[PDB]
């Protein structure tokens, strides 16, 4: 490494791995962490949480108009009553897609996403391409997901710059006559709750 140019040389990903193990080891040795505390977190985010919680909310809104109306009027109260509350989900707002309004959510500055409701974010949601472009050329971005909106549909992009979080309520598709709430929940994709996809008819 030429000392004029240390900034050309990234840390290898092996460094981050080693550093993680070093932090773990030091913190356990000093009594700050425990094996089981670390494992508890991993279990929570990898397995206990996930987009099935948002899917339940969407299916309930589709099946129960009174619930939908309460959800849109005061989502924080409603979601908390359902138990979809916790770290990074203290203040969750629901934004409704309509025929002429399409909502898309981002965290341009990082990765913010309502874990208690949706679980961990998509890979692409955290990376620069989506974050940089969706606020400026959302139609071009949405086309890369297969969603080609007419010029006449307004797009609202929601940048998660505070601790307030946003979840998109997608429209129920055609072809779903007679489906139960549980069957409808199975149709609700993670991507539809971010706004990068509509729901296909079955």
């Amino acid at each position: 490494i030429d000392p004029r140019f240390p900034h050309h040389h990234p840390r290898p990903q092996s460094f981050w791995e080693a550093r993680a193990k070093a932090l773990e080891s030091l913190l356990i040795e000093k009594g700050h962490l425990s094996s089981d505390a670390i494992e508890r977190v991993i279990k929570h985010y990898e397995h206990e949480l996930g987009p099935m919680n948002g899917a339940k909310v969407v299916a309930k809104a589709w099946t129960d108009p009174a619930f939908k109306q309460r959800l849109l009027e005061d989502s924080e109260t409603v979601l908390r009553e359902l138990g979809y509350y916790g770290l990074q989900g203290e203040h969750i707002r629901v934004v409704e897609n309509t025929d002429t309004v399409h909502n898309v959510v981002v965290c341009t500055l990082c990765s913010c996403y309502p874990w208690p409701l949706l679980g961990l974010p998509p890979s692409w949601y955290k990376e620069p391409a989506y974050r940089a472009r969706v606020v400026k050329e959302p139609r071009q971005v949405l086309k890369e997901f297969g969603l080609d909106l007419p010029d006449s549909v307004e797009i609202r992009v929601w940048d998660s710059s505070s601790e307030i979080r946003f979840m998109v309520l997608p429209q129920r598709p055609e072809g779903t006559e007679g489906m139960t709430e549980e069957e409808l929940a199975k149709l609700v994709t993670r991507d539809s709750m971010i706004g990068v996809a509509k729901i296909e008819p079955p």
């Binding site: 981050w16 550093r19 913190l27 977190v41 991993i42 890979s123 139609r139 890369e144």
Partner: protein, 227 residues
Amino acid sequence: MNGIHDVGGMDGFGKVMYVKEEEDIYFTHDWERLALGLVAGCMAQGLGMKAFDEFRIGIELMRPVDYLTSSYYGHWIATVAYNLVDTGVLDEKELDERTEVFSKKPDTKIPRREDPALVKLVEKALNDGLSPLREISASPRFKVGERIKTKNIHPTGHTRFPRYARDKYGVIDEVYGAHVFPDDAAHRKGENPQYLYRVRFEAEELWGYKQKDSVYIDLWESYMEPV
């Protein structure tokens, strides 16, 4: 800070790498899972960070070349290391030495310890969260529907005011209440809460573009002025 993390409106980052959700694997290496555990385990005890403001500035301070190459959970490792050293929980030299041990010998055994009371404490944090909503005695400066102009300010510390939104006209959409103020709290300078607003910006104002597009952004009161 006007850093590499503040990407909104940038060009050149390329296509989004679409993947089907069922195929969008959470973790491909064990250390990624560990990163997640370290963050929440520390934050639940107020070690290095009391909430996410301190968390975020440690990521923002990464070398740009590291920010772009570490992968996402590398950011999490970076900020845990930064904040634990900055607050005096860990010594930098000890941490660097131990890092070198694991780099050279990656199969080095990790010490084991069970602490069920700590598990309960961590759970409680995961369940109760860390709401930043506060009350202040002042009234809001702005009202729903008011046209404001965001300031041209360039904080050198942490801020939640993205560059693309600065010196722009917008319209107040909602007054949320007073929230812990990141630009102070990230630096351990007090919660000092201020009214938080949702503000709508039109594409024509942000970019000069001709689209039926808008951006809703949450902005603290001190980021804005009346017109």
